[PDB]
């Protein structure tokens, strides 16, 4: 191994010290996996053991690659990122291709391994410190720091950006209509090609990267998969927002019209042109909830106007690059979940709904996890950055079980909501 | 004089900071002489060294007499140096819990004497530890010294010592994979399954190694033999328990005494099952005044009595067998208190514990059970590195019904039902759709924020209507009161319509208990009903609303 450049010098933000974060307790299984992995990484010179004079710490976990039987090590760099990358956004920052979200197909490739060839700045290494914990606090943790660009650190692709650019240069020239964006360890490749030739082009890029020295373990089962599916494929052209729908009924009761007036009144927080007057006049008297109420002409006219105004997108909704993205998720039951990515309240940049599968495989936590991953991926493709989730789950529960189903090399920011109200059905 | 060839750990001052400078003149000749007698011997042992006064730094020095005055001790206050020294890795957060230890044929405890002074200090840093022994008046040059080894009370001492010890243990463990060494502070704990002769031989061998590195271990006896009173525990060869708990008798109690009492009870809870701290800790809601004398409530008295009855006879925990399954069992104590036992074999517990819900005004048994499962899962992952199998007082249909309709994602690992009353159940379920042939109650209530008067009432589709006045209430209380009136005056099946998002929020949460009596009564009514449908409408838009104030 040799250093192509010597090191890219890294400084922190003025008035900021290194990350000090507690390492979460781990299963014995995951501890052993991490021990094995790190023993090998130490053997290759990627990481080295450190002394008591290094105060800094970053959490570590063991996940599984995608479906595999082999353990993968995932370091959570969120804090170090905020303490470093905020200054390599400006300085080394990778520009985001707004044309990527317009492509018909987008494949995601894992380029992480590349970073391991490039050494890390000598003075910066102490900030990469992490701890493999011991069960029952029996022994002090095993302490390493990176000698090379770590995966999960946003500074890694930034430093490697030039190398990536010049490696991708020949492929970009023979394929000028293909969009290639790098977010951390991931390469997002868009195209308008037919699915088959799109896959062929992705394989061409794989062989290109490979013969240029970049392993991309997106390689399949070799020839024959039994029932499973190939590399991650997205379709951002179908990724537009969702409108608000009202129930279609042959007969309407007092209750139906009450839920209708309520939901419309809620929708008035978004669309100012909503009028509930003529629908409210029909409920004027005090009646049984199960009493069927025929719709007048005024009320029907009002319902038509409301349905018409509700199917058009919201005016004056734009993305502010200086503001953080916020993704709220609410659980709809029956394997369904709904979400909204916004910046300011009631101005929705994006909304959607996900149902994985029904029964005999997955539970709530698995679904919410996969949901967070999908939403984050969409967010990356569209704005070139991840949102901060408000998760409908108990904090300790999530902190316990999230690593089980996590297939992603990045982690977003999250907080937990114990509150959420009646509005559930209003989003479905 | 055991000087050590131990590789030093490089140490820096915090960036932009210099070494501490403090002049110590005081005080008396006797202390000076004692300091001389000590520092000469410390210098002889290489622990400290006299230095030429070229622009150095200084630290205050004191001499404090212990009981039995035959010996003296020197105390150097390093706080000002500790301010300027770099941060180090955290030393040890928690201790290992006895329930997580494995049974060994032999366990030896080793105390290392003068641990810090046996480990050298980084050369370039040594000058920052400099201090001065004062002359007897007359401003004559003071005696200058500096530490060559880890000073007691210095910020970096325990961590550096820990790493040094680990490195020293490294070659011995390599030649001895069949024994286990736990390092804690100045102590080592060596377990083995080796036969007693072989074990003792190995222990002496270890002692010799340590002595080769400049560390001492007891040659008189070998001292500690089980118990083994360690960190508030009692460690026995086949079992572990807590050290004896003593609950003091008092005619008067302050906040401090209640703090100590509750502490002792919490500590006792990990092994003795059934300990209840709720009523006693509720007295501590007086968090304003810490010296205030607190009178004991009857509930607290009864609870403390129960704890005394529980603590009457000793109980013991066992150790962990990795070859056996791990089971956790939970019971409800009824006051919002929960108790649990973690075990492997039926008549033995690894440990016990309790969960209480301080959080929230309203809650229910199922959610609390889930939270308990969470706490236990975390604790198990910490102690044994695995999650236990659960035995729970809940039917699967109950659980499924709850989590499927719950707005929050929850999950529980592999668990089975055990029938040990009280069982956890759903006491009522609101209808998902309005009930045909049921009287519809349009309810509402309101309060004046100033006068605190307010009122609550309903109007029904059958033309029936009621209004009741209230005193010392709030809008929320009036809305809940309205719903309660509707429940009181209705039949077995009722449709209620409220404009209050709050009240609907409380009811849809399906709480089985509350600290609010009103909500409790509403709950009772809800249990007594066959079918209740609660619906919400926008307020003040006058749809079906109540026009009266
Ligand atoms: N003073 C003092 C005691 C400290 C102490 C603390 C521990 F966490 C463990 C400990 O001893 C053990 C050391 C290594 C092991 F693998 C297991 C240990 O278990 C202690 C329980 N014990 C005690 C005596 C005995 O004959 N068998 C046994 O399992 C001693």
mmCIF file with all atom_site columns, C-alpha atoms in Angstrom, chain A residues 66-67 232 329 335 337 339 354-357 361-378 389 391 398 401-402 404-408 410:
data_model
loop_
_atom_site.group_PDB
_atom_site.id
_atom_site.type_symbol
_atom_site.label_atom_id
_atom_site.label_alt_id
_atom_site.label_comp_id
_atom_site.label_asym_id
_atom_site.label_entity_id
_atom_site.label_seq_id
_atom_site.pdbx_PDB_ins_code
_atom_site.Cartn_x
_atom_site.Cartn_y
_atom_site.Cartn_z
_atom_site.occupancy
_atom_site.B_iso_or_equiv
_atom_site.pdbx_formal_charge
_atom_site.auth_seq_id
_atom_site.auth_comp_id
_atom_site.auth_asym_id
_atom_site.auth_atom_id
_atom_site.pdbx_PDB_model_num
ATOM 1  C CA . UNK A 1 66  ? -28.018 -6.976  2.871  1.00 0.00 ? 66  UNK A CA 1
ATOM 2  C CA . UNK A 1 67  ? -29.437 -10.503 3.084  1.00 0.00 ? 67  UNK A CA 1
ATOM 3  C CA . UNK A 1 232 ? -31.723 -1.858  -5.695 1.00 0.00 ? 232 UNK A CA 1
ATOM 4  C CA . UNK A 1 329 ? -44.173 8.945   9.825  1.00 0.00 ? 329 UNK A CA 1
ATOM 5  C CA . UNK A 1 335 ? -48.693 -3.227  7.246  1.00 0.00 ? 335 UNK A CA 1
ATOM 6  C CA . UNK A 1 337 ? -47.353 3.444   6.914  1.00 0.00 ? 337 UNK A CA 1
ATOM 7  C CA . UNK A 1 339 ? -45.125 9.796   5.679  1.00 0.00 ? 339 UNK A CA 1
ATOM 8  C CA . UNK A 1 354 ? -45.479 2.243   2.095  1.00 0.00 ? 354 UNK A CA 1
ATOM 9  C CA . UNK A 1 355 ? -46.699 -1.318  2.558  1.00 0.00 ? 355 UNK A CA 1
ATOM 10 C CA . UNK A 1 356 ? -43.959 -3.973  2.490  1.00 0.00 ? 356 UNK A CA 1
ATOM 11 C CA . UNK A 1 357 ? -45.830 -7.273  2.737  1.00 0.00 ? 357 UNK A CA 1
ATOM 12 C CA . UNK A 1 361 ? -42.623 -12.206 7.862  1.00 0.00 ? 361 UNK A CA 1
ATOM 13 C CA . UNK A 1 362 ? -42.299 -8.776  9.421  1.00 0.00 ? 362 UNK A CA 1
ATOM 14 C CA . UNK A 1 363 ? -43.278 -6.826  12.535 1.00 0.00 ? 363 UNK A CA 1
ATOM 15 C CA . UNK A 1 364 ? -43.768 -3.124  13.288 1.00 0.00 ? 364 UNK A CA 1
ATOM 16 C CA . UNK A 1 365 ? -40.103 -2.301  13.978 1.00 0.00 ? 365 UNK A CA 1
ATOM 17 C CA . UNK A 1 366 ? -38.907 -3.978  10.774 1.00 0.00 ? 366 UNK A CA 1
ATOM 18 C CA . UNK A 1 367 ? -41.495 -2.038  8.750  1.00 0.00 ? 367 UNK A CA 1
ATOM 19 C CA . UNK A 1 368 ? -40.651 1.308   10.356 1.00 0.00 ? 368 UNK A CA 1
ATOM 20 C CA . UNK A 1 369 ? -36.952 0.622   9.784  1.00 0.00 ? 369 UNK A CA 1
ATOM 21 C CA . UNK A 1 370 ? -37.359 -0.197  6.103  1.00 0.00 ? 370 UNK A CA 1
ATOM 22 C CA . UNK A 1 371 ? -39.641 2.835   5.824  1.00 0.00 ? 371 UNK A CA 1
ATOM 23 C CA . UNK A 1 372 ? -36.996 5.136   7.302  1.00 0.00 ? 372 UNK A CA 1
ATOM 24 C CA . UNK A 1 373 ? -34.436 3.709   4.892  1.00 0.00 ? 373 UNK A CA 1
ATOM 25 C CA . UNK A 1 374 ? -36.667 4.187   1.826  1.00 0.00 ? 374 UNK A CA 1
ATOM 26 C CA . UNK A 1 375 ? -37.673 7.727   2.822  1.00 0.00 ? 375 UNK A CA 1
ATOM 27 C CA . UNK A 1 376 ? -34.026 8.592   3.445  1.00 0.00 ? 376 UNK A CA 1
ATOM 28 C CA . UNK A 1 377 ? -33.000 7.227   0.041  1.00 0.00 ? 377 UNK A CA 1
ATOM 29 C CA . UNK A 1 378 ? -35.701 9.273   -1.691 1.00 0.00 ? 378 UNK A CA 1
ATOM 30 C CA . UNK A 1 389 ? -37.276 11.818  11.449 1.00 0.00 ? 389 UNK A CA 1
ATOM 31 C CA . UNK A 1 391 ? -40.493 8.372   14.890 1.00 0.00 ? 391 UNK A CA 1
ATOM 32 C CA . UNK A 1 398 ? -35.883 1.704   18.744 1.00 0.00 ? 398 UNK A CA 1
ATOM 33 C CA . UNK A 1 401 ? -33.955 -3.185  17.740 1.00 0.00 ? 401 UNK A CA 1
ATOM 34 C CA . UNK A 1 402 ? -33.098 -0.861  14.822 1.00 0.00 ? 402 UNK A CA 1
ATOM 35 C CA . UNK A 1 404 ? -31.402 -5.743  13.205 1.00 0.00 ? 404 UNK A CA 1
ATOM 36 C CA . UNK A 1 405 ? -33.049 -4.712  9.937  1.00 0.00 ? 405 UNK A CA 1
ATOM 37 C CA . UNK A 1 406 ? -30.721 -1.857  8.975  1.00 0.00 ? 406 UNK A CA 1
ATOM 38 C CA . UNK A 1 407 ? -29.190 -2.478  5.538  1.00 0.00 ? 407 UNK A CA 1
ATOM 39 C CA . UNK A 1 408 ? -27.802 1.029   4.941  1.00 0.00 ? 408 UNK A CA 1
ATOM 40 C CA . UNK A 1 410 ? -25.535 5.795   6.506  1.00 0.00 ? 410 UNK A CA 1
#
